[PDB]
Design a protein around this ligand. Structure first.
Ligand SMILES: [Cl-]
Ligand SMILES: [Cl-]
Length: 162
């Protein structure tokens, strides 16, 4: 198990524009297209992202390319953010994957606001951080994905994911 397989399990793969859990136009492996309600704003964003007229549909390759970009951007965002970086540096390899997952899903900005959890993670207070992370809209809106990430953060193993 690695960050790529972990996220591919949590987001799935869809080759056709679809709506995410929040109602946003998305494609491939959790690649958000637009928060706008228009399906044309979404196909426009898509063609821009792919470099071709897609008519809302893409190949496996295309989806994986977007995915590679997005994990990369997630990682680079963490390393650039003054609140995230120190947490990430302090963690072990499994736990780092989970932090990435948390960022991919929710933006640097959002994760960076999880102030208290961040401080607990850094102090390696696992059980307590798990308890705090669960008191969030995040957990309440996507509880099974959330529990898997939290478990990874708590344990430091890939158990939730076998
Ligand atoms: Cl893009
Ligand atoms: Cl879920």
């Amino acid at each position: 198990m690695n960050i790529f397989e972990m996220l591919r399990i949590d987001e799935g793969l869809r080759l056709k524009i679809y709506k995410d859990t929040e109602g946003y136009y998305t494609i491939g492996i959790g690649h958000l297209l637009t928060k706008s309600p228009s399906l044309n704003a979404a196909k426009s964003e898509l063609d821009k992202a792919i470099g071709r007229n897609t008519n809302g549909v893409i190949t496996k390759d295309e989806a994986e390319k977007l995915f590679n970009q997005d994990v990369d951007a997630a990682v680079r965002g963490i390393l650039r953010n003054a609140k995230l970086k120190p947490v990430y540096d302090s963690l072990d390899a499994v736990r780092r994957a989970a932090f990435i997952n948390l960022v991919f899903q929710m933006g640097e900005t959002g994760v960076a606001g999880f102030t208290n959890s961040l401080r607990m993670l850094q102090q390696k207070r696992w059980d307590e951080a798990a308890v705090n992370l669960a008191k969030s809209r995040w957990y309440n809106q996507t509880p099974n994905r959330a529990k898997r990430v939290i478990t990874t953060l708590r344990t430091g193993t890939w158990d939730a994911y076998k």
